[PDB]
Design an enzyme around this catalytic site. Structure first.
Site, PDB file in Angstrom:
ATOM      1  N   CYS A  72     -23.059  69.223   5.801  1.00  0.00           N
ATOM      2  CA  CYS A  72     -23.345  67.921   6.408  1.00  0.00           C
ATOM      3  C   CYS A  72     -23.720  67.977   7.904  1.00  0.00           C
ATOM      4  O   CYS A  72     -24.338  67.042   8.397  1.00  0.00           O
ATOM      5  CB  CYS A  72     -22.122  67.023   6.204  1.00  0.00           C
ATOM      6  SG  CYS A  72     -21.483  67.119   4.497  1.00  0.00           S
ATOM      7  N   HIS A 102     -19.550  60.547  12.279  1.00  0.00           N
ATOM      8  CA  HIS A 102     -19.788  61.116  10.953  1.00  0.00           C
ATOM      9  C   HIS A 102     -19.481  60.071   9.876  1.00  0.00           C
ATOM     10  O   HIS A 102     -20.334  59.814   9.024  1.00  0.00           O
ATOM     11  CB  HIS A 102     -18.956  62.392  10.769  1.00  0.00           C
ATOM     12  CG  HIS A 102     -19.294  63.087   9.483  1.00  0.00           C
ATOM     13  ND1 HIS A 102     -20.531  63.598   9.143  1.00  0.00           N
ATOM     14  CD2 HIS A 102     -18.460  63.320   8.412  1.00  0.00           C
ATOM     15  CE1 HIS A 102     -20.436  64.129   7.911  1.00  0.00           C
ATOM     16  NE2 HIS A 102     -19.198  63.976   7.434  1.00  0.00           N
ATOM     17  N   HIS A 113     -24.444  58.845   2.153  1.00  0.00           N
ATOM     18  CA  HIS A 113     -24.387  60.137   2.813  1.00  0.00           C
ATOM     19  C   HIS A 113     -25.438  61.097   2.249  1.00  0.00           C
ATOM     20  O   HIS A 113     -25.268  61.642   1.158  1.00  0.00           O
ATOM     21  CB  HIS A 113     -22.959  60.689   2.711  1.00  0.00           C
ATOM     22  CG  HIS A 113     -22.751  61.974   3.469  1.00  0.00           C
ATOM     23  ND1 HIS A 113     -23.573  62.500   4.445  1.00  0.00           N
ATOM     24  CD2 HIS A 113     -21.688  62.814   3.331  1.00  0.00           C
ATOM     25  CE1 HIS A 113     -23.018  63.636   4.875  1.00  0.00           C
ATOM     26  NE2 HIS A 113     -21.873  63.858   4.233  1.00  0.00           N
TER      27      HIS A 113
END
Lengths: 847, 847
Positions: free
Chosen positions: B158, B289, B328
């Site tokens: 990520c 995040h 995401h």
């Protein structure tokens, strides 16, 4: 910026489970390409029969890495092997799990194969998410070793290792990190991956025929290899310095994306040398990309020729390619190039190419003699080596390395002395191999220092412990399987009867032991005692005095304590027998070395001056209550040594008569050499006042710690004011009172490591009998033993094998780091020492 | 080190084919997560119904990227879309294919999905090797754009985009590169990949509920997005500066490898601010995040709180997560974070989070009010924004960006003037959309300057060409499909009869045209001619003189030539009619502007002073040989204009009689306004000597180039010494000799672009008839046209649409780069303009 060193290396290569086996295959001219069914059936899909293959990919010491079986089964085999190889590279640098923990170490991995995920995703196992994505390989390494630097997977195809090295080099130069792991991996599990490369016309049928006119493609190969990088100032080992690394891309080529641009390769090389201000002519050897392709080999070598072969360069540039020996390990390939360069810098010889018979006529520098292919093991005198690695997508990288040529001008003072080597391993077989390797390198103090610096592992991580004696006269090996629970260490200080002629001569070879005795001698010299002469030149008559045994025993007990402390050995418990409580008081920090030696001196002086009537002492085979009930008037039980062993003390005439009466009853009787003094009896009451007054001028009273169990005071009085302090009164009372030694020994755990600190371990049989079979009992010296330095090391080696932590090198002068060029590798011995008993899942070839 | 700017951006996001649509979805509070069967059937494997999906992944303009159908079918859809997105980001920076070609531009790609290779490897297609490995995505971009910087694929899960940004930032700071593409991609083709993440407990059933107490996992999403980075000094656009970027790893966490360490995240953030010497309190917004996980959200936000929420910070730290809006996008996720930050810096408003109802009670900074979640579009006044991105393997990254807040203090002088907008595209529909977007931004000279700077594409790459007039009074659009073969450009200089009252008034608005006339006026002023007054205030009587038409026509022809040259328009061929050969001689570089204007002056002066007898001229509907045979004594054929059009010249009385005789035969007759002079006849022989002597004092003879076809000299004499030089003799002979205009026009290719340089395009019908239907014929002015600036731009726009290359902004003051804050994006209009007619292979879900 500090200089950046490659400090450690390890790897798995085709037919090579270590850097050592890879070295032997390279110099032996062994073709590491094989034709067997290890990955898929021979002739499957009409593929080339040749493939560079790791010997094993299904073995991994999962317990050492704290991985359960479910995590291990779904972990990429590349990552399993890379965990072991990273530990081996850390150990090879003289580092440990403890030294890298929490460090600013970056992890930079070249990885591109997704074959494990492709094979296993159909299982729907959640452990695939932690085991197979490329990021999880470097992140698993950073997690296990507790590394806080960047942790990154790189893919630029064949150049990925040098791209990862460039990133690590930049982060070290800019101060982002203090150390780095740079690694590269490749495996060949799926025949379909080879089939698409064959259909692209990339694969040759036999080998990478680098620089040869018959070059017709590459052979696929496997690799798992890692480097440990550190600043040269902070390194224990240096193989070489990284001078510079750069990467670029070919951009647009009119021949197509996979056609190499020799012009952009030239531009990259020129920028590398300009940036570090190095003249390209200083490079004497060049490890080429050298895949053995008809287009690639001429483009690369003619770019090298234009940059490196300047008109003023007199000597030909030596060139080679490790791909001729092992094939092309794709994404990991530059790890084999770096390993070959490090081997050449370490051994002083460049390993030869294979398959070179007829130079490719398009290679200009082979035609004019400005370049030469290394076809035999060629001597190399240090300086600079260069490495090319070029990705099939035009991602180029170039690195320059410099040799580390620092040699030791003098052998270390202890290189040929007896030394205790101690190590730990995962298996008994691996440990016995490490102990043999240490014997092979017995003359290398630098190798021993690297091994000792890397040996710091948690007691549970390495369950086998062992020791050997290097440069000994006798073969000594001990190997034991330890429990993960620590053992208590107990120091037992013996009393009278441990003295013998020459008792210090052998251990005076150790500087710590000698300096401790020299200090004790300086303290006694004003009192007219020449301690060093008594210990070195002393006779049986010298030791018949009342005084000399006391000062000798206590001075040796102080020197043995200093020696154990120098090696990091500390007691959890302390017990003394008679005058041994002076050694206990030193060990517990209650007396200084000067106070301890003077306490022994005044004890002997006051007994000498007191003109005590003739006495005797004898060990007798009676219980404590039998001795109390059977002793005649004028004889007393003086020492309770064991359940069935009492020392009696009394008037010489009454003792002699009672000893004959006991022998006539088949009771064991052995006279103790007490110099005709009845110690630990009413005979010493007349000495008490004089001794207490003398000791009150010497001893500064300090509290006893709970570690020291008194034997001069009953257990019910241990919390009494006299028993809480090492005072003149305590040490004077010790002379008069009985020795309750058996009572104190019963408090020691049956699993303890008991070390007897005496000139001779006279209590060994008593200690071992009382503590039982699970205990470890050792003396540090034996009376008239041939070599008491070997006896000391064998005793400490036996303690280490049973769970004692120590640094056995601390009794010798330290090794200066970094170690000199040519110090043997450590990675090879670790690579052979894993627990590979379990077999793990590997991706199967497509049916 | 120079400041590092983000200069351009583009992307594809869930339900968003551009940054503009993504902006509208963010501010519109549109949930970009959808529940449809685009990837696999709803309810397959009991997966979450929600998935962030790109609208199209099977469309790609393969011809623009020079990719054949076989290569395109086996190219990863992520790489296909990324090629388009990289071109869009380059154009958005005001750069072109020509400006990036051969540059030190690095390519840094976050990529981790191997799903295309997994789906297609069973085909054994060799094109998979060039299409699916991660390295081939960045390398294909470097290959197509001809980029010589590093070209690297990164995987840290990520965090990969910010790790790629750190590498690009370091390479720019160290001078390895001058510019960079930083990109991130993610696609969700295989339901099994979602299934293993669901089985790990990572997936929520609805959305990324960032900072909410109901946060229960993330929703998977897709992205393809790229940034163009340049030094601020070298940038045409600046969205923001990159202040600093760093990465680290969590190392060992006792909760396990996938558990985030807020303490190591805190350490990373502190190091970022310390290294750049920025106080953390200066950050007013933080793009977290923020995955909506019960463990992650509190660990991150409390680490942010400890670093950013200093005791002296009065205003709450605004926080958000774009993952609440779009899900995401894993490896590509920070591209959405960066895009949202750039949108906030560009628009002056922070886009709101979705799904925030009840703050997670473990988030300390939401409980004490030191932090606030953005839940409505919130004004932002510039300064610093921060971005977190954390990999599931503990690879953390943190970035700080600074807004670009330079505003223009004054509108550009040409912002509201008529401007020719010219552009090229892949499709007619896309081009018509771009021309409408340019009309929407008609007041932005800065937008037009970026479009003009990015418009430099090879003629074959963008087959549709078109133009519109911005800020015009009349709607003008032209769109044509060009052939890839260049067309010849011919300049045709008209003669007498092109003059009219006010002929210069409109084009004097252009500085280049005005300054050329001012120079010509300065040259004529010593001769008693007020050129500017004749052109601005002149009447029909002012233009009845012999002299004034000559100086007006030639001065305008010089000024029109200077105007076309300023826009980069150059002729391949030049043809003149009568006095038009003076304009030809200027255009060919044979005369200076001063020599050309003086040549026209002396031509008119010598004819005036020569007191020539009364003459007339008329255009007649005869062939050249009919005119020769039918002309009475004292009349001659003077100009061969077309096959069926001759101008006759002669004595006024004889001409009038012959014109009536021709009309009586139904022959077309039109008198030409020659101010009663019989030009191109024996009447001019008496002027020849005086004109030749006057011109010999003005003209420095230079050779004529092969581009200029003479009309005063027959073709068989073109290589003669008089015809090889623009001399006093050549220009004096032009007055006497017939005009062989039809002979010269027949040498022009039938596909040519013919531009008539005159005060009025009187020859348009003749030129078009002779060159035929495939030709493009335009005038630059029309007599008494309402706006001759629009007429000029419509004429040039029609030439551009037919293959003429020009810069239409070069007639106005330049725009200063970098352009001010809020200049409209270019990426959005390019994203809508691709040829998506073909459908390409996409990985199918596992059955």
């Amino acid at each position: 910026s500090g200089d950046i060193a490659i400090a450690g290396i390890s790897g798995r290569y085709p037919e090579s489970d270590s850097v050592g086996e890879f070295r032997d295959n390279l110099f032996g001219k062994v073709n590491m390409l094989t034709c067997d069914d290890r990955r898929w059936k021979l002739g499957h899909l009409d593929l080339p029969d040749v493939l560079g293959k790791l010997r094993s990919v299904d073995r991994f010491d999962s317990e050492f890495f704290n991985l359960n079986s479910k995590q291990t089964e779904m972990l990429d085999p590349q990552t399993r092997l890379l965990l072991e190889v990273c530990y081996e590279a850390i150990v090879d640098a003289g580092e440990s799990l403890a030294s890298v923990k929490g460090s600013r170490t970056g992890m930079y991995l070249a990885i591109s194969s997704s074959e494990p995920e492709q094979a296993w995703i159909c299982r729907q196992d959640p452990y695939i998410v932690m085991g197979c994505p490329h990021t999880m390989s470097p992140n698993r390494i950073s997690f296990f070793f507790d590394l806080h630097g960047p942790s990154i997977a790189y893919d630029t195809a064949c150049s990925s290792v040098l791209v990862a090295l460039e990133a690590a080099f930049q982060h070290m130069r800019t101060g982002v990190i203090d150390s780095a792991i740079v690694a590269g991996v490749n495996t060949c599990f799926r025949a379909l991956t080879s089939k698409v490369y064959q259909n692209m016309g990339m694969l040759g049928p036999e080998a990478c025929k680098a620089f040869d006119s018959s070059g017709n493609g590459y052979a696929r190969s496997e690799i798992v290899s890692a480097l440990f990088l550190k600043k040269s100032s902070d390194s224990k080992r240096i193989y070489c310095s990284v001078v510079n690394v750069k990467t670029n891309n070919d951009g647009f080529t009119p021949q197509g994306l996979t056609f190499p641009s020799g012009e952009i390769q030239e531009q990259l090389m020129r920028n590398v040398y300009a940036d570090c201000k190095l003249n390209p002519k200083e490079v004497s050897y060049f490890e080429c990309h050298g895949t053995g392709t008809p287009a690639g080999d001429p483009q690369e070598t003619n770019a090298i020729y234009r940059v490196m072969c300047t008109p003023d360069k007199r000597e030909p540039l030596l060139i080679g390619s490790v791909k001729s020996n092992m094939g092309h390990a794709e994404t990991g390939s530059a790890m084999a190039s770096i390993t070959k360069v490090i081997l050449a810098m370490h051994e002083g010889f460049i390993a030869p190419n294979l398959h070179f018979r007829s130079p490719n006529p398009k290679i200009e520098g082979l035609r004019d003699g400005k370049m030469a292919v290394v076809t035999e093991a060629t001597p190399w005198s240090g300086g600079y080596m260069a490495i090319n690695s070029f990705g099939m997508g035009g991602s180029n990288a170039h690195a320059v390395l410099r040799s580390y040529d620092v040699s030791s001008s003098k052998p270390h003072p202890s290189a040929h002395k007896p030394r205790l080597f101690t190590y730990s391993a995962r298996t008994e077989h691996g440990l016995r191999a490490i102990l043999r390797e240490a014997q092979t390198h017995a003359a290398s103090m630098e190798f021993h220092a690297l091994c000792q610096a890397s040996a710091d592992a948690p007691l549970g991580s390495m369950p086998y412990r062992g020791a050997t004696i290097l440069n000994g006269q006798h073969d000594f090996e001990v190997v034991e399987k330890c429990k993960s629970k620590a053992r208590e260490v107990w120091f037992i200080y013996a009393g009278m009867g441990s003295q013998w002629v020459g008792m210090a001569r052998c251990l005076m070879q150790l500087d710590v032991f000698r300096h401790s005795l020299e200090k004790s001698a300086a303290v006694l010299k004003p009192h007219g005692v020449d301690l060093l002469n008594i210990l070195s030149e002393g006779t049986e008559d010298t030791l018949r005095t009342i005084l000399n045994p006391f000062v000798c025993i206590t001075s040796i007990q102080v020197a043995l304590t200093d020696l154990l402390w120098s090696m990091g050995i500390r007691p959890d418990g302390i017990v003394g027998h008679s005058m041994g409580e002076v050694g206990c008081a030193y060990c517990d920090g209650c007396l200084t070395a000067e106070e301890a030696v003077l306490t022994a001196y005044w004890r002997g002086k006051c007994v000498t001056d007191g003109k005590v009537p003739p006495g005797k002492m004898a060990a007798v085979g009676l219980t404590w209550e039998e001795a109390k009930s059977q002793c005649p008037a004028g004889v007393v039980p003086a020492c309770h040594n064991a359940e069935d062993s009492v020392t009696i003390s009394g008037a010489a005439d009454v003792m002699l008569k009672f000893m004959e009466e006991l022998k006539a009853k088949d009771v064991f009787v052995r006279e103790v050499n007490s110099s005709n003094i009845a110690y630990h009896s009413y005979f010493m009451e007349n000495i008490y006042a004089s001794l207490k007054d003398s000791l009150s001028k010497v001893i500064s009273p300090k509290p006893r710690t709970a570690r020291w169990l008194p034997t001069s005071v009953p257990e019910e009085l241990w919390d009494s004011a006299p028993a809480q302090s090492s005072s003149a009164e305590f040490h004077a009372n010790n002379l008069v009172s009985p020795v309750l030694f058996h009572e104190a020994l019963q408090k020691i755990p049956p699993t303890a490591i008991a070390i007897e600190l005496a000139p001779h371990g006279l209590l060994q049989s008593v200690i071992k009998r009382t503590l039982g079979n699970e205990s470890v009992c050792v003396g540090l010296q034996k009376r008239n033993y041939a070599d008491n330095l070997e006896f000391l090391f064998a005793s400490l080696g036996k303690c280490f094998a049973n769970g004692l932590s120590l640094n056995p090198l601390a009794c010798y002068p330290p090794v200066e780091f970094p170690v000199p060029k040519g110090t043997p590798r450590l990675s090879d011995m670790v690579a052979g020492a894993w627990d590979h008993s379990a077999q793990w899942l590997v991706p199967k070839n497509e049916d």
